[PDB]
Amino acid sequence: QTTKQFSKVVEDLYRYVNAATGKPAPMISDDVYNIVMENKDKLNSAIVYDRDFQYSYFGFKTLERSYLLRINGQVAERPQHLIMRVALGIHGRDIEAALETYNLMSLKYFTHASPTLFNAGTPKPQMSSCFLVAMKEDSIEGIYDTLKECALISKTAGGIGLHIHNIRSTGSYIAGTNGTSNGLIPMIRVFNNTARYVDQGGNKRPGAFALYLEPWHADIFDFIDIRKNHGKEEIRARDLFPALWIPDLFMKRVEENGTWTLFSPTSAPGLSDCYGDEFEALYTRYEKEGRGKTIKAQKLWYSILEAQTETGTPFVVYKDACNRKSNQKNLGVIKSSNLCCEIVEYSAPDETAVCNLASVALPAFIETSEDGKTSTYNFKKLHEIAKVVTRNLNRVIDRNYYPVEEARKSNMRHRPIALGVQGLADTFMLLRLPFDSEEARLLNIQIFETIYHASMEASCELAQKDGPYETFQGSPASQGILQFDMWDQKPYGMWDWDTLRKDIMKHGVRNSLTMAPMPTASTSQILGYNECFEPVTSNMYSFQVVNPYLLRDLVDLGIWDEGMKQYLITQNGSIQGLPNVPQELKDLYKTVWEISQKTIINMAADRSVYIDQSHSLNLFLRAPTMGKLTSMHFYGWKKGLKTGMYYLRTQ
Amino acid sequence: QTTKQFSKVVEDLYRYVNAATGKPAPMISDDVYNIVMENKDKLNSAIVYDRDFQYSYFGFKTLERSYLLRINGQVAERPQHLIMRVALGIHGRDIEAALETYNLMSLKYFTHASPTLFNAGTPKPQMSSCFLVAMKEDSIEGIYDTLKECALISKTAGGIGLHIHNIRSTGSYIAGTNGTSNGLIPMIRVFNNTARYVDQGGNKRPGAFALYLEPWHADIFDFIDIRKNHGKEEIRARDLFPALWIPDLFMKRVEENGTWTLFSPTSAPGLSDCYGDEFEALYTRYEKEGRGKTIKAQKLWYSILEAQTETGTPFVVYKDACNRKSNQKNLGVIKSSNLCCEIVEYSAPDETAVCNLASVALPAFIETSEDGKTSTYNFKKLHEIAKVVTRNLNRVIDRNYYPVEEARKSNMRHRPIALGVQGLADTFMLLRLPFDSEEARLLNIQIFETIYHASMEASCELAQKDGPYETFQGSPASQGILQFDMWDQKPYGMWDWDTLRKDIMKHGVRNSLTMAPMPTASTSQILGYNECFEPVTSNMYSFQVVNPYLLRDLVDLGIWDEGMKQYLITQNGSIQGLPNVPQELKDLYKTVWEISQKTIINMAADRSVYIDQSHSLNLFLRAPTMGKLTSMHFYGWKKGLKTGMYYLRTQ
Ligand SMILES: Nc1ncnc2c1ncn2[C@@H]1O[C@H](COP(=O)(O)OP(=O)(O)NP(=O)(O)O)[C@@H](O)[C@H]1O
Numbered sequence A, B: 001q002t003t004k005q006f007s008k009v010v011e012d013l014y015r016y017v018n019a020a021t022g023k024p025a026p027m028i029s030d031d032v033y034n035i036v037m038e039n040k041d042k043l044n045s046a047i048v049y050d051r052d053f054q055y056s057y058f059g060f061k062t063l064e065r066s067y068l069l070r071i072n073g074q075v076a077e078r079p080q081h082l083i084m085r086v087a088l089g090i091h092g093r094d095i096e097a098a099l100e101t102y103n104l105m106s107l108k109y110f111t112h113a114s115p116t117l118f119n120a121g122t123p124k125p126q127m128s129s130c131f132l133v134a135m136k137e138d139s140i141e142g143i144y145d146t147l148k149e150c151a152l153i154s155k156t157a158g159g160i161g162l163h164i165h166n167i168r169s170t171g172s173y174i175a176g177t178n179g180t181s182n183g184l185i186p187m188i189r190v191f192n193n194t195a196r197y198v199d200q201g202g203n204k205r206p207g208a209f210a211l212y213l214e215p216w217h218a219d220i221f222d223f224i225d226i227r228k229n230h231g232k233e234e235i236r237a238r239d240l241f242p243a244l245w246i247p248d249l250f251m252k253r254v255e256e257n258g259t260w261t262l263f264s265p266t267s268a269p270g271l272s273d274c275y276g277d278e279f280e281a282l283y284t285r286y287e288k289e290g291r292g293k294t295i296k297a298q299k300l301w302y303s304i305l306e307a308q309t310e311t312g313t314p315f316v317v318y319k320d321a322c323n324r325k326s327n328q329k330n331l332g333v334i335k336s337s338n339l340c341c342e343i344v345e346y347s348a349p350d351e352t353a354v355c356n357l358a359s360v361a362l363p364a365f366i367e368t369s370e371d372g373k374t375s376t377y378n379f380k381k382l383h384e385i386a387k388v389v390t391r392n393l394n395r396v397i398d399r400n401y402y403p404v405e406e407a408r409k410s411n412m413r414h415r416p417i418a419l420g421v422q423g424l425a426d427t428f429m430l431l432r433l434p435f436d437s438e439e440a441r442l443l444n445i446q447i448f449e450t451i452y453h454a455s456m457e458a459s460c461e462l463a464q465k466d467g468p469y470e471t472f473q474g475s476p477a478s479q480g481i482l483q484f485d486m487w488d489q490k491p492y493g494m495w496d497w498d499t500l501r502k503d504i505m506k507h508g509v510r511n512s513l514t515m516a517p518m519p520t521a522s523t524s525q526i527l528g529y530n531e532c533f534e535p536v537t538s539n540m541y542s543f544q545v546v547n548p549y550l551l552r553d554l555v556d557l558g559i560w561d562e563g564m565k566q567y568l569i570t571q572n573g574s575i576q577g578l579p580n581v582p583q584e585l586k587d588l589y590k591t592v593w594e595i596s597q598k599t600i601i602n603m604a605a606d607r608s609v610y611i612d613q614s615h616s617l618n619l620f621l622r623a624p625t626m627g628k629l630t631s632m633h634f635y636g637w638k639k640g641l642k643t644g645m646y647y648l649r650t651q
């Protein structure tokens, strides 16, 4: 019920015409069509259609539902065809690299983020997932230009993070009239409205932008409350996500139980265009000068926590930790993260930051291969594959179709890239390692060091062929200061950092950033592994499937029965305090709510030194409480995390 | 409790500084300040402060509430100061014309529309009331550019009429995705949202745009329903006004009880860029070609009437009558009217049409001066004053501050102007003429002929000094075809049209259009006369004042008492079927609901031949019914009215 020969499938796709309209609607690009036809034999015979049986029933139905291209609502592309198309879309004329990417992706070593999977090798190749946008100016012209931009971006795949620190707060003065300003909320309501009007890619799910405000902005209280399902209606913005861009001085005032001061950006200019001490200097001076409204820090705090407890938002991202520890610091002051709090990239009115994403599948490197029946981890294959994905994401930068000029400007200047991971929890389980074990802690550090090292090396090789990126000179990287150096730490040492730093100083790197582990929400589901780097949330998930690693074990112990089936549904996928189940299994299959959030922050802190950018650290709290949240926020803060919190997931 | 010397008042205004902010906020322009100081003696001694006692208690409190400039919430300008400032803002260095305009305005011969009163002689002189905007393109870029434009326009005084015939309808195809379009409504919802976010001038009342669609657009049914207070919520747009831009062919299909066909503009291009026969030719061809959805004309009809009955909207404006009979026809096809259905001016993506407005006060020309105690009408003073206002509106064009480039382009090319009137009903009453009398019918024709003639002559003189307007060549006017010629009628003849046409053909006119009688909602209330050209809606209005002409008469007849007071409140200001009241009085003070709508359309049809543009014809129906509305719509249509209906006012 789908044509088999690949080039025949391309033919159809490429020759498509929309019957309702009589318009030719080719779904393959010219340049990719040509490549395919010019190499039809090599390409056709390289595919291995058994590999379609690598996908779980749920894995495949995800692919089927919205990934594999359709001709008149009918799926016309086999999973292998999707992959082959992707590999071509990325690799163009370089058939060898294409062919390499094909095998590895089909073998499920890694995958590319959804935009790539959707649009690679199609005429409008928009393979980018992230856009961080700057509010252009505190004017009606600036506001509507940015609005126009978000709409144009939203037309295609990819989420937006938008920062709005420069917008005049409620009641602020306006030259030329006696009218006074209305603040962020009415304006937020405009963005929200545009988010709902512009389809993403052309389908069901709404626009969703994330909004970045620094907690001193005079409209903060309402801003943080944007997602509440009560109060009024016209004070909310229920399709957007508030994200706090928090400076240390705030955390400090909260801790010391002191005061916080709210400014309108026009009474207190420059607050967001600096960080660390210069910021505190400037902020304290403005406070002295009575340009704002002072209140007790802990009153803002307490509000911030109420919102997180109810909505899981705002997210928290530490402005200082982000700017102090960015390889982009030479470009200027970074003003926001993105929609999923993983990207940390400079943006300006004329530079909208972009990022391409792929995820290495960590389980694929477990080989129970030595002799007996221990497993090891093949960190050599991890390095190799990590290098390939680096090269891929880099190719994507050039072949990408940018939705707006400020995106193309930004990407061609700095070439940031984003690697991350899926199936950490799987690797751990397969390796008989409890998520909170000293062994798992070692493995985390190790996996991440090796990806960072790999991608930095592969990027170094690139710089050697195509020159460093335009803005390499002046970077921490160009001075020998890599990610972990900015954490005042020594790398674990599994790889040779001296030689790499040596080369990097000599030849540069092609990419300003490389690592930003992301949520993997849908691309982990295709491959059949757990979300990114978080532990399982349940052993039962939901049409209800028992954890295959758990299940396997329950059988070998001849204890899997009806009570064991139904207990898992009762106890929502938890095996703790369950009568006939060994301590080994109990430790290994703790749900995420059963692991200390201190351990999570620890391992997050551990891998963070090999992360160029940030990672989407979700927090999970079972029995939620002000004080409990407070110690999780501050704990992470002091660890020097960038993304202190993505969602607060609860119940 | 307000400084008296005028130049002192300017001084304060001009020297103002906003204390909260420490910013200098001058409220007079540089060039006007200089003029004032350079002529302080002439200017100070020309004012006559008794004239402040020309204003009724309600008249003055309107002026006080939002017209006279304030210094720290405290009124600092006397009505005479407002006027003097206006006359200067219009007339600049020409002190004689300034001084002329001052006397006439203070004497209440005429006034300028509210934007003028608000901003003349201030630093951001935006004295324009009307903007007709073109939807830039059926793209997300075009949509958001227009949105940006409406916002920038809304920043200052003046209402918008926006036409959207070129936007792709629900479910229409989009190249580049499998997504399908969502039609006008979601997009309308975006405009609506911007209308509420951008304050007008800087105060309370919401943005309000009027939206112009041709009834064949495939989204018509929902479009016409935009103002209903039920159904759903997300299908409505309750801060905008739908206006039908109706072609004859529709009226015809409705009458002949035939079919109507709905097209998306992309399946049926060019429909709005033509009119009359070429349109019917093109439309019928598209129908034959099955590019649309056909339904029974009378089903659309019946829906259109349900909406008017409930919401008083959509307005009706006949596209063909507008284009066939416009002096702007040489410019291209006019695609919309404005917010109050009086302006009929060409617009394009790069030309947003503008208009300045003043209203002659018709009562001021009644002089009971011959000998005995008949009154006459001084049509010679009407001609004179009408000429002055022409010159004024023309000066305003040059001294105006345009909110966007497409407005400045449009106005400097064609220089349209807009005269109208207030206190028709007053003139009639003062002259002992029932609104529906053959005498009142004669006076209407007469008043309007004389304003048209006057303004055309005064504009001719201008063309002689400053050249014709850029696009005069090719105009009906340049061929000797004036307004009434396009109605295939001969003018009443009270003035010498041969000589004027002769001169116009020779020298041109400065303005492409001159006459567009408007609602006068607030500027008739300042002067203390009834709205524009409509009859009184009540003799009692509302803190309740009895019609002074009625009241006067009731006293001289010694019949005004308690029963007469309270009867008027009971019968909502109607004197019909009331026991001790002469037939003379009953005929003279019919409320508007007591006058045949056929008579209204007649007199509207009568003055329409001296109207360059259109006029805001409100319809009043007491006992509303499908068939009754139907005969009022068709009656007006056949009379060749442009604005068939502004609001349907009911109850
Ligand atoms: N009519 C209006 N309605 C609502 N908000 C407005 C309006 N005018 C300005 N603002 C807000 O005020 C800020 C300044 O807008 P902008 O258009 O730059 O003002 P401006 O007229 O140039 N005056 P200023 O910026 O004070 O010199 C922006 O954040 C706008 O959102």
Ligand SMILES: Nc1ncnc2c1ncn2[C@@H]1O[C@H](COP(=O)(O)OP(=O)(O)NP(=O)(O)O)[C@@H](O)[C@H]1O
Pocket: A154, A155, A156, A197, A198, A199, A200, A201, A202, B138, B139, B140, B141, B143, B167, B168, B173, B174, B175, B176, B179, B181, B182
């Ligand atoms: N992602 C989207 N969501 C909602 N409406 C859209 C989207 N993309 C396009 N439209 C509508 O489709 C029409 C065409 O938009 P435009 O941006 O010109 O499309 P395009 O991508 O250039 N394709 P086309 O115009 O069909 O050649 C406009 O009326 C838009 O309102």
Ligand SMILES: O=c1ccn([C@@H]2O[C@H](COP(=O)(O)OP(=O)(O)O)[C@@H](O)[C@H]2O)c(=O)[nH]1
Pocket: A112, A113, A114, A115, A129, A130, A131, A157, A158, A159, A160, A338, A339, A340, A341, A342, A357, A518, A519, A520, A521, A522, A523, A524
């Ligand atoms: O629902 C979503 C999820 C994600 N993203 C974007 O994709 C990035 C990572 O998303 P994720 O890994 O969850 O999606 P995947 O690539 O696996 O499909 C984010 O930073 C967003 O910019 C988005 O636009 N909508």
Ligand SMILES: O=c1ccn([C@@H]2O[C@H](COP(=O)(O)OP(=O)(O)O)[C@@H](O)[C@H]2O)c(=O)[nH]1
Pocket: B112, B113, B114, B115, B129, B130, B131, B157, B158, B159, B160, B338, B339, B340, B341, B342, B357, B518, B519, B520, B521, B522, B523, B524
């Ligand atoms: O509430 C209003 C009424 C009017 N207008 C604009 O002003 C013109 C005429 O308005 P009107 O005569 O009623 O107002 P006035 O000039 O008397 O204050 C219309 O065509 C609109 O463009 C507006 O923006 N808001």
Ligand SMILES: [Mg+2]
Pocket: A138, A139
């Ligand atoms: Mg400004």
Ligand SMILES: [Mg+2]
Pocket: B138, B139
């Ligand atoms: Mg287009």
